[PDB]
Amino acid sequence: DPFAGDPPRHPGLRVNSQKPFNAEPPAELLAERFLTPNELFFTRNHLPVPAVEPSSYRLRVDGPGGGTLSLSLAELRSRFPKHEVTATLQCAGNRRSEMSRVRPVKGLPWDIGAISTARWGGARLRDVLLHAGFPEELQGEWHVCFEGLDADPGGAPYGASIPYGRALSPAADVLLAYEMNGTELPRDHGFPVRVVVPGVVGARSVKWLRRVAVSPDESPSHWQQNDFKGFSPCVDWDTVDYRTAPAIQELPVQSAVTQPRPGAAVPPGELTVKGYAWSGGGREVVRVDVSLDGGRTWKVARLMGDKAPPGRAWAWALWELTVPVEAGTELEIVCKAVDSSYNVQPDSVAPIWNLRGVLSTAWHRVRVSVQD
Amino acid sequence: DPFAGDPPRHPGLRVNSQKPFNAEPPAELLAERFLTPNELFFTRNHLPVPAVEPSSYRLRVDGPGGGTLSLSLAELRSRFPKHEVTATLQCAGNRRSEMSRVRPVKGLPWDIGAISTARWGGARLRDVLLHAGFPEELQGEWHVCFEGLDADPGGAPYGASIPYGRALSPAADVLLAYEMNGTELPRDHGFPVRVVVPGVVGARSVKWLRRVAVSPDESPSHWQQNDFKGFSPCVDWDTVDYRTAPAIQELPVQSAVTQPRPGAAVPPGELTVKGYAWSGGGREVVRVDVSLDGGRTWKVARLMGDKAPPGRAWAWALWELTVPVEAGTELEIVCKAVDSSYNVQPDSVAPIWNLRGVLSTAWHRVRVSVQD
Numbered sequence: 055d056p057f058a059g060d061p062p063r064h065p066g067l068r069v070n071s072q073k074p075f076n077a078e079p080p081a082e083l084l085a086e087r088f089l090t091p092n093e094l095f096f097t098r099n100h101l102p103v104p105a106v107e108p109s110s111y112r113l114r115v116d117g118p119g120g121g122t123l124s125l126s127l128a129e130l131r132s133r134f135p136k137h138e139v140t141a142t143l144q145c146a147g148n149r150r151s152e153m154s155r156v157r158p159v160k161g162l163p164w165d166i167g168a169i170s171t172a173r174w175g176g177a178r179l180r181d182v183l184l185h186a187g188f189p190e191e192l193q194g195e196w197h198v199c200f201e202g203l204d205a206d207p208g209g210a211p212y213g214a215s216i217p218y219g220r221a222l223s224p225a226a227d228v229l230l231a232y233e234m235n236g237t238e239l240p241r242d243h244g245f246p247v248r249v250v251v252p253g254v255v256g257a258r259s260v261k262w263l264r265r266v267a268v269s270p271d272e273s274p275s276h277w278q279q280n281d282f283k284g285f286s287p288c289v290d291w292d293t294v295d296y297r298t299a300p301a302i303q304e305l306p307v308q309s310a311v312t313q314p315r316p317g318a319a320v321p322p323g324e325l326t327v328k329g330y331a332w333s334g335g336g337r338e339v340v341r342v343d344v345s346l347d348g349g350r351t352w353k354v355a356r357l358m359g360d361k362a363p364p365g366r367a368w369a370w371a372l373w374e375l376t377v378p379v380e381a382g383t384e385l386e387i388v389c390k391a392v393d394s395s396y397n398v399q400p401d402s403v404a405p406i407w408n409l410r411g412v413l414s415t416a417w418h419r420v421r422v423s424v425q426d
Numbered sequence: 427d428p429f430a431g432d433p434p435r436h437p438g439l440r441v442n443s444q445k446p447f448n449a450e451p452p453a454e455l456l457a458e459r460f461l462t463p464n465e466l467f468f469t470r471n472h473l474p475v476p477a478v479e480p481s482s483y484r485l486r487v488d489g490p491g492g493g494t495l496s497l498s499l500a501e502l503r504s505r506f507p508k509h510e511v512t513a514t515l516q517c518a519g520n521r522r523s524e525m526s527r528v529r530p531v532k533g534l535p536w537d538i539g540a541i542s543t544a545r546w547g548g549a550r551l552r553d554v555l556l557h558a559g560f561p562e563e564l565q566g567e568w569h570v571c572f573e574g575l576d577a578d579p580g581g582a583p584y585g586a587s588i589p590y591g592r593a594l595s596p597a598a599d600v601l602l603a604y605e606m607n608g609t610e611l612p613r614d615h616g617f618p619v620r621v622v623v624p625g626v627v628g629a630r631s632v633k634w635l636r637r638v639a640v641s642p643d644e645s646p647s648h649w650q651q652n653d654f655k656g657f658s659p660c661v662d663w664d665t666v667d668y669r670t671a672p673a674i675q676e677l678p679v680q681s682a683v684t685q686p687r688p689g690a691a692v693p694p695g696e697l698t699v700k701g702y703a704w705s706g707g708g709r710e711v712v713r714v715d716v717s718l719d720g721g722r723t724w725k726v727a728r729l730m731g732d733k734a735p736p737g738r739a740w741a742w743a744l745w746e747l748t749v750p751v752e753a754g755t756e757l758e759i760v761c762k763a764v765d766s767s768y769n770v771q772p773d774s775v776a777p778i779w780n781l782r783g784v785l786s787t788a789w790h791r792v793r794v795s796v797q798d
């Protein structure tokens with residue numbers, strides 16, 4: 055069994071695939087803490103988890119002229135000043151199951167928890183690339199390609215890329231992380247080194263980093279070219295042309311209700327409704343509207359968190375709103391967020407439906423009853 | 427009459443206010459050309475149009491230490507290399523009248539034409555500020571405040587501000603424009619000098635520029651502090667607190683159908699449906715979906731224009747889609763756009779309604795009939 059050497063996990067997760075392991079935290083715990091504990095942070099593995107001996111590990115970094123820099127773990131820790139960045143990672147497939155309610159799609163059936171937040175510690179990718187000898191600025195459109203140590207039976211590594219400009223920007227905070235919430239990177243989350251690309255879809259944060267290369271083109275890997283793209287609702291498996299749509303990088307504004315859960319019976323008097331909101335590209339969440347009546351009327355929620363600098367809101371905003379609730383009534387609790395560019399979430403899922411089930415950002419709706 | 431010295435205008439505009447002058451081009455002409463002719467470009471004036479003698483004109487630029495640089499028109503033309511930027515300006519109030527259909531709002535009743543596109547020529551604001559002696563980077567959050575020559579009866583100039591970072595960024599393309607579509611700036615559009623802030627709401631592109639100042643704070647002017655902000659649908663005139671929401675800078679993804687027009691009877695066979703789409707923040711439009719049946723099914727439109735570099739799509743994308751149409755049928759033509767961060771437009775207007783009528787980006791719907 056290629057998966058026999060996989061790490062053990064916390065017993066209470068919502069697992070949607072054992073092999074490869076793909077799991078999200080229970081929704082009742084997801085927004086309990088601003089920083090998701092390591093043991094609960096959602097896990098998305100395409101492949102078996104690599105088993106890495108720390109001391110023999112080398113990160114290969116290809117330089118401008120085609121020479122190869124080779125960095126040990128200890129050298130990554132000591133050569134470059136450690137930077138810490140608190141960033142939310144969200145999988146493209148988050149809330150996919152709601153898309154499937156409209157018309158079935160292919161993909162891991164994620165509920166609202168394919169998103170988590172951690173403080174990440176590591177080398178700035180910018181610094182590593184300058185050390186390899188690259189300039190601030192290359193002419194034209196360049197990309198930094200990443201390969202992980204995990205590979206399919208045919209030998210193709212997990213791979214992704216980001217634009218060179220984002221890799222080199224001080225403000226974009228792209229990390230080669232070896233620390234997660236103050237402890238060393240767990241195996242499931244990329245031990246010993248992962249890329250963390252703040253404000254950008256989870257897919258680009260390559261775990262178990264083996265190689266960093268600079269190229270005139272995007273990553274040639276199947277996951278960069280033939281996956282993680284959004285399409286019209288009209289597109290099906292027979293008509294899909296992956297060249298017609300851009301690789302997802304930044305994600306659009308997103309939110310969900312974590313408390314209370316669908317089907318609940320809640321006591322009369324006061325109900326505290328909680329959830330999360332987040333947007334891609336470092337765009338702050340500026341407002342979260344909450345409705346108890348299926349989105350006819352709304353009240354403004356309270357946003358928690360400490361504000362980040364402009365253009366650098368990498369971390370989700372947790373929200374809450376305490377409302378009065380009348381004995382023996384039905385509620386449809388809906389939330390929607392607004393980011394600093396004043397993007398908004400769409401009303402319904404059908405018009406954003408796509409064959410891959412990605413980019414599921416329509417209002418989250420939770421139906422509950424009030425007890426008597 | 428304070429408006430007697432105002433310029434004459436093209437006879438065929440859709441004027442919503444004579445004094446001060448506020449007008450949009452007819453929708454049938456709006457998307458006819460990629461670059462909106464100067465005579466048709468939408469005009470938004472809060473005040474009488476300033477009468478400016480070109481030679482005695484001086485732009486005041488305050489330097490780092492509180493000294494004042496003073497620049498003539500000729501010096502602005504000769505001192506700094508002319509840069510050309512093609513950018514769409516969209517008023518916050520675009521498509522306000524559709525918001526009013528839900529619940530009446532205060533404001534100029536714009537239809538879909540409070541948006542236009544031009545190639546702008548001028549000094550990079552970045553270069554002017556470096557010449558005044560400012561550094562690449564100031565510590566903390568700084569703003570560049572602009573004042574126009576137009577003032578109210580009490581003497582307060584039109585004013586706005588943008589973040590310092592955007593003013594200094596080579597890639598953000600902020601201009602002090604003295605040329606518009608290859609000719610000198612018309613009076614209505616800011617003669618002799620206006621700021622052009624690409625990817626950002628029209629309000630910040632100060633016309634008739636008199637002063638540029640660098641400040642630790644946003645512009646203190648009423649239009650920066652107590653206007654151009656988005657609010658929840660629940661907020662009314664008695665509850666509004668302008669400190670709770672950020673000044674609009676970047677605008678969200680937007681589109682409209684320009685052809686055919688509401689109420690039309692069209693011939694059977696083939697119908698070419700045309701419109702525009704655009705997004706704030708230099709985010710490209712990557713797809714436009716069009717529906718003939720009120721948004722139940724959709725087809726992908728054709729996007730026209732030449733692609734801009736990543737993060738710099740300042741100009742709208744014009745779109746078209748030719749469809750078959752059956753004799754004696756009713757159509758509800760709807761469009762929606764998707765930007766490069768995969769933001770989308772919301773289904774309906776009520777949930778985005780606000781008391782100022784700004785930020786009106788729900789699907790544009792056009793009802794027509796087919797002849798027999």
Ligand SMILES: Nc1nc2c(c(=O)[nH]1)N[C@H]1C(S)=C(S)[C@@H](COP(=O)(O)O)O[C@H]1N2
Nearest residue numbers: 096097098100145202212256257259260261
């Ligand atoms: N090497 C490698 N990196 C990877 C993946 C993978 O399968 N292999 N999955 C990607 C995807 S699709 C997501 S959403 C994130 C999930 O990161 P997490 O497991 O730490 O939450 O990792 C990304 N990085």
Ligand SMILES: Nc1nc2c(c(=O)[nH]1)N[C@H]1C(S)=C(S)[C@@H](COP(=O)(O)O)O[C@H]1N2
Nearest residue numbers: 468469470472517574584628629631632633
């Ligand atoms: N000096 C000055 N600048 C101004 C205005 C104004 O009233 N005075 N209107 C602003 C607003 S709200 C908009 S939408 C744009 C409109 O620019 P246009 O008239 O060239 O289309 O100008 C902006 N710049």
Ligand SMILES: [Mo]
Nearest residue numbers: 145146256257
């Ligand atoms: Mo993912």
Ligand SMILES: [Mo]
Nearest residue numbers: 517518628629
């Ligand atoms: Mo405006």
